[PDB]
Amino acid sequence: LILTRLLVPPLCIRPSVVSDLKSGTNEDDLTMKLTEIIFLNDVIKKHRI
Amino acid sequence: LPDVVLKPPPLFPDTDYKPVPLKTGEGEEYMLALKQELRETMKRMPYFIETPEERQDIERYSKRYMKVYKEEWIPDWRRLPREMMP
Amino acid sequence: GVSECIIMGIPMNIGTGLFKLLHKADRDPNPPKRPLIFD
Amino acid sequence: ADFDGDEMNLHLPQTEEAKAEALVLMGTKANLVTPRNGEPLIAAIQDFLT
Amino acid sequence: MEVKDANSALLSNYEVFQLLTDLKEQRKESGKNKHSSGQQNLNTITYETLKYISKTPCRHQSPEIVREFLTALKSHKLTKAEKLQLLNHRPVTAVEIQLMVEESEERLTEEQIEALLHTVTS
Amino acid sequence: TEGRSRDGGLRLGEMERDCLIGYGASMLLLERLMISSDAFEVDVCGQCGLLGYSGWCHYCKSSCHVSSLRIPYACKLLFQELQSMNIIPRLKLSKYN
Amino acid sequence: RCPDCGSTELVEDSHYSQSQLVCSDCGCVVTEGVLTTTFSDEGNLREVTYSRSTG
Amino acid sequence: KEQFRETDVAKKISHICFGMKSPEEMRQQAHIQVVSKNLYSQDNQHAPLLYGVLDHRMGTSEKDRPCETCGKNLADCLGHYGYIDLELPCFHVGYFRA
Amino acid sequence: RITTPYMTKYERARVLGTRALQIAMCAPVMVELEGETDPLLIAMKELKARKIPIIIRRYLPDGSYEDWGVDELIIT
Amino acid sequence: QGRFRGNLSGKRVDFSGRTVISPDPNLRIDEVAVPVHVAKILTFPEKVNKANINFLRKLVQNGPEVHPGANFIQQRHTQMKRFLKYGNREKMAQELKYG
Amino acid sequence: FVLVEMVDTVRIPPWQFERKLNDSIAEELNKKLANKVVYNVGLCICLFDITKLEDAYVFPGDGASHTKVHFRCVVFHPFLDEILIGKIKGCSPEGVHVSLGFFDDILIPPESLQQPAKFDEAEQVWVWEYGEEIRFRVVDESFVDTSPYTLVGSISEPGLGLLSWW
Ligand SMILES: [Zn+2]
Ligand SMILES: [Zn+2]
Ligand SMILES: [Zn+2]
């Protein structure tokens, strides 16, 4: 019940659209949440060090 | 801000602290020897029940020669309930 | 149930899926067995 | 329906078993009555009763 | 595709020969084109096994002779594997029973070999 | 897709599903919701009950108990989302007989 | 090239709202069907720029 | 010569047994480890980083870039999961009442 | 022998669909069709003629089963 | 619009069309009119058998242009579809095998 | 040669209904078990007979007739001591390559027990003098599919004398 590993799903669940009309792409919210989680983990590791 | 990491951390990260060596002494040596003797002698003990082999290929005249023979201890049926008799 | 069947993509038990059909093929149940000569 | 611009859907089965089941169970000639009370719904309408 | 018993009952070469002959005659009587083109390994394996069993001396055998040989060996307290090997090989010489056949020690007796040869040759 | 300009098809809503269930056309409902909408073949491991790929189970590192199975792509996506949520649906397959 | 005749006359011709790369010699269908996000997916997805996604 | 192996079986699902996975089972199920917080590379091609998010080894989402784990296109790729280890454990909101 | 002898509409539909699929899969015809290019029409003709080689296996809730032939059942 | 209600209970399908309705008393109660434009788009997969072989041959010779016809053919051996708009339709009709 | 009990779910297409069910099942089983080695069983030759054949079901999918048939099949699986007569289909330095008559080229007798004049110099030399007999010793099977043969066995050739051929 207490989680120590997060299961990032495949890319089929996180569709990404390459919008060549601008310098950006359309990404889902799960990708941003996982990116924020990884950033927070890195920040916690930096603070611990 | 925290820097980004390209490759993942090592599966077995190194540590600057090593385990303290094992205590030496005739006592420890004798305990090790006794534990090894127990490991070697308890497998052949009748209490060590092995997986009953099955699915024999054929019967041969050498069956009586290769027949495994080992004495079997008799449990105390007075102390053990009746639900364990063969 | 029916909802789980529809979700999994299998014929629901209700309706036409409650029973099963058999083929009326020309056969012979328990055909003659070849006798064993060596045994 | 009242023929006042209503958009209806039309589907084509892709299996012989589904086709047969749709023709038998969902047949117009076999579903001329409703299971609520058995009254016939497929009957005459305006411009026909008169 | 699971199997229930891989050693249900042993059989000699005469049964396999009869089965292969029956399959071959049924095939040449009801030959099909598409069924044969779908899998040609069946024809090859059947033909080669039949050719091997014809090369071997398994010919000139019958169920009556097999039953007679079995009843004759039943009086020799010989084991199923020994009698099966003897029926499959049809040894005409004595050395083939003296050395080739296993479990020779205490079973030859130097007197039963003549009876075994007579029974396998009759 | 949804819209006509996007080359979208009709929607068999919950009311249509209820009507089909009331009629009892099980094969019709199946052909509509599974065969002609999101038909797809996956590989399920008969040992752990997980989903593999190309007839291979990365969990058990074996391919003897892996077998194909028809399943809606929406149901497969739901199973993947649950496995991500840590709710692991263990599928125990068996013969159709 | 075509898997049947080996010809290189592969043309992308949409047949009644169905993108399909089909050969022009024998009509063999090489590839068919394309996956494109719908209005719901486009509205649910959020726009993130390279200034942030690249690093 | 040739071994007997069944090609396809008419397997029918009997029942779904829900459950949970431990960290060890999650690691065993996952294929790679995602540790990079960025998505694409610095080059102008904007290719996805390795051992990071949006990696093609955990499936594919583009019709041009196929999957790296299995040599198949998007229409045939089923996808693969990944495991991300956390420094400190956290309560699972779904199982917090439990 | 305890169930109703009449053949229900669901059984009718399932039998007709199965026979139409078999015929579309190049199955033998036992009625000598006369220019019927529709497998469903051929199946309906075979049902009316009572020559469909299919046996319904009705299962009871407890687990028992009973066989009923198309020619043995009553049609409407 | 969830996975249970939006993608499992109610989902979209193909081979369907939405159109306006109009009155026509000259048709039976069990009959419905379908326009040629939607009929040429909505196709039905028919298996080649010993009964409708000539009908399928005629439909293939007609082709996608004429209303009575077909649009694609999937061979029994190979699952590679063939577009009737390209290539000689007469050869495809003459090489129609069962299955 | 030995019988093996098997239970297989055979699927017969509809266009074979004109044929007899038992004959079709036998032909399908033969085509499916022709020249194939079943793990821990041996190499199957052909079908012997059919014992039990229950009702024939028809699923709502493919529409074919699926029948669960119990049958017995003959397989080549010695009993670790069987004697056979094969032919030398070549020879290698580490060991001769003998093969039963047109049956299977999988017998690899190790040359580590004959009298102490055993050696192969690649010139197809069998053995220095003082229809080849074979004595099976052990069996062994292995799998094939391990990513996204299977029967060799061990042969023995003791000092059988062989008065007919050295
Ligand atoms: Zn597994
Ligand atoms: Zn081409
Ligand atoms: Zn993949």
DSSP string, chain H: --B---S---EEEEEEEEE---HHHHHHH--SB--B---B-SSTT-PBPTTBTT-GGG----SSS--SSSS--TTT-----EEEEEEEEEE-STTS--
- Type of residue found at A36: E
Residue J55 CA to residue J61 CA, distance in Å, equals 10
Interface of K with H in 92-151 (CB under 8 A): 104, 106, 143-145, 148-151
Tokens found for residue F16: 């249509």
- Provide the terminal-to-terminal Cα distance of chain A, rounded to the nearest Å: 28
Query: Which residues of chain B make contact with E80, given a CB cutoff of 8 A?
Result: 58-59
Q: Which residue of A has its CA nearest to H21?
A: A1
Residue E35 CA to residue E24 CA, distance in Å, equals 15
Query: Which residues of chain E make contact with K30, given a CB cutoff of 8 A?
Result: 23, 42
Q: How far is CA B13 from CA A6, A40, B9, C7, H44, in A?
A: 21, 21, 8, 46, 35
Region label for D29, one of left (φ > 0), alpha (ψ between -120 and 50) or beta (otherwise)? alpha
Tokens found for residue I39: 């497998």
**J70: number of CA atoms within 13 Å, CB side?**
24
| Pairwise CB contact (< 8 Å): I25 & J47 | yes
Nearest CB to G24 within list J41, J72, J86: J86
DSSP β-bridge partners for residue K12: K65
Chains with ≥3 Cβ pairs under 8 A against K? B, C, E, F, H, I
* E to A contact (≥3 Cβ pairs closer than 8 Å): no
Chains with ≥3 Cβ pairs under 8 A against G? A, F, H, J
- Residue H48: what are its φ and ψ, rounded to 5°? -70, 145
Residue E102 CA to residue F80 CA, distance in Å, equals 62
Residue E25 CA to residue E30 CA, distance in Å, equals 9
Query: Which residues of chain F make contact with C8, given a CB cutoff of 8 A?
Result: 71-72, 75
Q: How far is the CA of G3 from the centre of ligand 2 (A)?
A: 7
| Sequence-separated (6 or more) residues with CB below 8 Å from residue G46 | A26, A27, A28, A29, A32
Place of tokens 């059984």: I11
Residue F32 CA to residue F21 CA, distance in Å, equals 12
- Report yes or no: I1 and I68 within 8 Å, Cβ to Cβ: no
Interaxial angle between packed helices E41-55 and E13-29, expressed in degrees from 0 to 180 and rounded to the nearest 10: 130
| Sequence-separated (6 or more) residues with CB below 8 Å from residue A6 | A34, A37, H83, H84, H86
Tokens found for residue B14: 């190194």
- Type of residue found at D29: K
| Pairwise CB contact (< 8 Å): I54 & C21 | yes
- Report yes or no: K97 and K134 within 8 Å, Cβ to Cβ: no
Residue E42 CA to residue H89 CA, distance in Å, equals 62
Interface of G with A in 14-53 (CB under 8 A): 37, 41-42, 44-51, 53
Tokens found for residue H13: 């699902």
Residue F46 CA to residue F48 CA, distance in Å, equals 6
Residue A12 CA to residue G53 CA, distance in Å, equals 19
User: Taking Cα atoms as reference points, which of F41, G40, K62 lies closest to residue H76?
Assistant: F41
User: Taking Cα atoms as reference points, which of A12, H78, H17 lies closest to residue F43?
Assistant: H78
Q: What torsion do the CA atoms of K93, K95, K96, K101 make, to the nearest 10 degrees?
A: -140
Based on C-alpha coordinates, what's the Rg of chain C? 20
Q: How many CB atoms lie within 10 A of CB H78?
A: 22
User: Taking Cα atoms as reference points, which of K66, K21, K28, K20 lies closest to residue K47?
Assistant: K28
Q: Which one-letter DSSP state was computed for residue E4?
A: E
Residue I7 CA to residue D28 CA, distance in Å, equals 20
DSSP β-bridge partners for residue D40: D33
In chain K, what are the domain boundaries? Answer: 2-76, 82-158
| Sequence-separated (6 or more) residues with CB below 8 Å from residue H29 | A7, F50, F58, F59, H21, H81, H83
Which CATH number is I31's domain given?
3.90.940.10
- Provide the terminal-to-terminal Cα distance of chain E, rounded to the nearest Å: 44
Nearest CB to K150 within list H3, H10, H70: H3
User: Taking Cα atoms as reference points, which of F43, F44, F41 lies closest to residue F92?
Assistant: F44
Residue K57 CA to residue K9 CA, distance in Å, equals 10
Q: How far is the CA of H76 from the centre of ligand 3 (A)?
A: 8
Tokens found for residue F22: 């009331």
Please tell me the total number of residues recorded for chain E in this structure: 122
User: Taking Cα atoms as reference points, which of E81, E91, E23, E28 lies closest to residue E56?
Assistant: E91
H61-G10-F6 Cα angle (round to 5): 45
Q: Which one-letter DSSP state was computed for residue K96?
A: E
User: Taking Cα atoms as reference points, which of H13, J1, D22 lies closest to residue C7?
Assistant: H13
- Report yes or no: H25 and H43 within 8 Å, Cβ to Cβ: no
| Sequence-separated (6 or more) residues with CB below 8 Å from residue I43 | D20, I15, I16, I17, I19, I20, I23, I52
Q: Name the burial class of residue E95, with classes exposed (0-12), middle (13-18) and buried (19+) by CB atoms within 10 angstroms of its CB.
A: middle
* H to D contact (≥3 Cβ pairs closer than 8 Å): no
Q: Which one-letter DSSP state was computed for residue G45?
A: S
Place of tokens 């169905």: G18
Place of tokens 């080059």: H43
> Which range marks the domain in which residue I43 is found?
1-76
Ligand nearest to the CA of F46: 1
Tokens found for residue A34: 């996982």
G21-G14-F5 Cα angle (round to 5): 140
SS3 for I62? Answer: coil
Range K2-76 has CATH code 3.30.1490.120: yes
Residue K137 CA to residue K20 CA, distance in Å, equals 43
Tokens found for residue D18: 């589904």
Region label for B10, one of left (φ > 0), alpha (ψ between -120 and 50) or beta (otherwise)? beta
Is there a binding annotation on residue H77? yes
Q: How far is CA H39 from CA A24, H55, J75, in A?
A: 12, 8, 45
Interface of B with H in 5-64 (CB under 8 A): 5-9
- Report yes or no: K22 and C31 within 8 Å, Cβ to Cβ: yes
Q: How many CB atoms lie within 10 A of CB F50?
A: 23
User: Taking Cα atoms as reference points, which of E75, E14, J68, B70 lies closest to residue C38?
Assistant: E14
In chain J, DSSP assigns E strands to 11-12, 16-20, 72-74, 81-83
Tokens found for residue B74: 């008799």
DSSP β-bridge partners for residue D24: none
Residue E84 CA to residue E61 CA, distance in Å, equals 14
Q: Are strands K65-76 and K95-100 parallel, antiparallel or unpaired?
A: unpaired
SS3 for F91? Answer: strand
Place of tokens 């051996």: J77
Interface test with K, best of I22, I51, I70 (most K CBs within 10 A): I22
Q: What is the interface size between C and E, counted as CB pairs within 8 Å?
A: 23
Helix (H) or strand (E) holding K52: strand K42-58
Tokens found for residue B18: 């090593």
Q: Are strands K154-156 and K42-58 parallel, antiparallel or unpaired?
A: unpaired
J76-J77-J82 Cα angle (round to 5): 70
Q: How far is CA K152 from CA B62, H49, K2, K135, K140, in A?
A: 26, 48, 18, 13, 7
**K47: number of CA atoms within 13 Å, CB side?**
25
Residue F24 CA to residue D21 CA, distance in Å, equals 9
Domain count, chain I: 1
- Report yes or no: K77 and K42 within 8 Å, Cβ to Cβ: yes
User: Taking Cα atoms as reference points, which of K11, K64, K24, K17 lies closest to residue I30?
Assistant: K17
- Report yes or no: E80 and K134 within 8 Å, Cβ to Cβ: no
Contacts of range E96-102, beta carbons closer than 8 Å, 24 or more positions apart: E99/K160, E99/K161, E100/K83, E100/K133, E100/K160, E102/K81
Place of tokens 């020799």: E76
| Sequence-separated (6 or more) residues with CB below 8 Å from residue E114 | none
I15-I18-I20 Cα angle (round to 5): 105
Residue K155 CA to residue K95 CA, distance in Å, equals 11
Helix (H) or strand (E) holding F69: strand F66-70
Interface test with B, best of H36, H57, H58 (most B CBs within 10 A): H36
Q: How many CB atoms lie within 10 A of CB K50?
A: 20
Q: Answer whether K30 touches H (CB < 8 Å).
A: no
| Pairwise CB contact (< 8 Å): K6 & E1 | yes
| Pairwise CB contact (< 8 Å): F27 & D11 | no
Q: How far is CA G33 from CA A11, H66, I30, J16, in A?
A: 20, 16, 41, 17
Q: Which residue of K has its CA nearest to H5?
A: K38
| Alpha helix positions (H), chain G | 39-44, 50-53
| Alpha helix positions (H), K33-156 | none
Place of tokens 């006369």: I34
| Sequence-separated (6 or more) residues with CB below 8 Å from residue E56 | E13, K85
DSSP β-bridge partners for residue G28: J82
| Pairwise CB contact (< 8 Å): D20 & I40 | yes
DSSP β-bridge partners for residue K69: K8, K53
Based on C-alpha coordinates, what's the Rg of chain J? 18
| Pairwise CB contact (< 8 Å): I10 & F24 | yes
Based on C-alpha coordinates, what's the Rg of chain F? 16
- Report yes or no: E8 and K3 within 8 Å, Cβ to Cβ: yes
**D45: number of CA atoms within 13 Å, CB side?**
7
**What top-level class would CATH report for the domain K82-158?**
mainly beta
- Report yes or no: D34 and D43 within 8 Å, Cβ to Cβ: no
SS3 for E115? Answer: helix
Nearest CB to G35 within list H40, H41, H63: H63
